[PDB]
Write a protein that binds this ligand. Sequence first.
Ligand SMILES: Nc1ncnc2c1ncn2[C@@H]1O[C@H](COP(=O)(O)OP(=O)(O)OP(=O)(O)O)[C@@H](O)[C@H]1O
Ligand SMILES: [Mg+2]
Lengths: 630, 74
Amino acid sequence: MPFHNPFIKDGQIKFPDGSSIVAHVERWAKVRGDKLAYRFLDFSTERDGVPRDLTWAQFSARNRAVAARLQQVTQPGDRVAILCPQNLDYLVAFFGALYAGRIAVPLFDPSEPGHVGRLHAVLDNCHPSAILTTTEAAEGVRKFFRTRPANQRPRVIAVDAVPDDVASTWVNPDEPDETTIAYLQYTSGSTRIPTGVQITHLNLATNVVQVIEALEGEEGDRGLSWLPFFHDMGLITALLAPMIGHYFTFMTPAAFVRRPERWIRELARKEGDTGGTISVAPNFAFDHAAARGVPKPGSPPLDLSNVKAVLNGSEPISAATVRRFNEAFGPFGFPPKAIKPSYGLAEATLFVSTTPSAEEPKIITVDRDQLNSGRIVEVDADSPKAVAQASAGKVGIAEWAVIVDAESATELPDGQVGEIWISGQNMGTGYWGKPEESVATFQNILKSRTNPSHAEGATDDATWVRTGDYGAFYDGDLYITGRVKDLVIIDGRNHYPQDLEYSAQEASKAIRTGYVAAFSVPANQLPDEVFENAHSGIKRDPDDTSEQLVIVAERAPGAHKLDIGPITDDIRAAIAVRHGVTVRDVLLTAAGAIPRTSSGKIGRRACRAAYLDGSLRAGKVANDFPDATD
Amino acid sequence: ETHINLKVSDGSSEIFFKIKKTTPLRRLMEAFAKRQGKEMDSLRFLYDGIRIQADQTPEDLDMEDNDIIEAHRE
Ligand SMILES: Nc1ncnc2c1ncn2[C@@H]1O[C@H](COP(=O)(O)OP(=O)(O)OP(=O)(O)O)[C@@H](O)[C@H]1O
Ligand SMILES: [Mg+2]
């Protein structure tokens, strides 16, 4: 009766023939075709929702029909972009592409607001031969592609109009090998243009097993999500079902935002539950549900003592977020251990590490001076040197993470900060259309290990992925300190931008957390206003290329307008006093000026590029991603 | 070859045509329209569930020999 993972034999992941996710769906369709597989909670008409269900047999029939059509109008190796709204047909489209032996590219309905830049970027990278959408979304799709070049408007298919009987000619693709790409997982584009990780069927099945292992997932554990399927975390949670054997329930992000209690109520114990709910949540989901999702006084009873796991990722978990969610939902039986901080990224399919099931989220405070010098040392939370670091827990099975001095490719002792490199069969096989970056990122050799080593279990000729993150192992746990490309290096000293950004928002009322970015630029690329300002502390020199600190922040929409003078003064003094670095320029913009990512987070390299070009200054619309040369 | 065979169906009447890939589907649509006793704008024509315009050609739509056009009202 302890947890046994059916896909693991002697600590190893074993896949017989027919272990691709397509084979698993077809298997369920055969042995229990009438069993519920996928449920979409449709809130478009009914406020309380209308469940739309698909059994395994029904799911299979739709997948094979779409796949058969796809095999008539596309070639092996072609990419097929999914531009469906988030509903059952999105999954039919995605699986249909897999069933067809084509490379799925999960995107979104172009009618969705704000995301058009990402859509162009992905289409310019992977060039799909077919677009899958629905009849409802078809017109918006047509209109979107009118904004693409005439030779960039691939054929469009509405998957809900493809008849069942089309499936009769479907050909099951051959058993995939470890090079057979199933789909592209695009990165969030935090430090660059979104890049497409090549996820194989082996990658996918492996990481599903790794997630099942990490969560101790059972067939009675209902899966639940509101996340977009084009997000890293959104997709994999929806793909557990054919292997774990639960049914998966989802809603749109807009539905969650409008009424977060909808998610809370689905998390809760249902009559007939024989397991615990598994879901997924960025910090925002916790924050929003805590503030807008607590049942009103007099509401029906709410029991959250059943929840097994809410996987938290894409970011470090916040201590305040954890406090607020448990204060809000603890009275309803929510188990603090259900919050699972985790480390993940597209390059690993998704999942790398999380807490053991016994444990609660761990957030420590470390010494700023030691941290900036590359070492982790704990200090009291009330110390003026305190910097918060969130544990991402333990590396998963058949997977490895090591902390490394990148230049020499040698493992560092615990407590020391370096590049996180990772290895495992869940690691993607490259970036689409970027062969050189693929070699540099995915094909690294670990030249030297410590004793003991976090690479223990990996072959010595194993290939290692450069995550682009700084981090460390400390007291048994993995911590991510920041992004390599974002590290602010000025006058021979290191500064973490989020640490600088936190000081800036603390210094001024006009500076809001999440609406400020810190980065450096060469001195001679600074705008003229800087050199003409007395308080900047720097004057023009065409040969001065030394890195200088820049802060860019947004004001609230409205409440126009206050003097930038005392705002700049407050920020400059506060950062100098705490960090010993002097900001050379503080630029304030209107709301929505600063380029952001999928998640809705500031992309610092893109903010930097838009500062330097200089869009933000004159109020121009800023490019959502940095140039490929950045 | 320069021609393809196209089959149009409204759920009952399954009528076959032949047309040059460069020829607008207008004449083909109107031909099917009245053999059903209806007029053209009383019908919508779909190819893979996507609405066709009358001045679009098979070549514009990457149609192949023996493709199906489904005809609905509205
Ligand atoms: N527990 C965590 N703590 C801190 N950061 C995290 C955590 N989990 C994920 N992240 C951040 O999210 C990243 C994964 O994001 P994703 O793969 O979607 O693209 P991205 O790295 O944000 O964008 P790009 O690769 O284009 O710069 C990780 O590399 C890490 O930087
Ligand atoms: Mg990344």
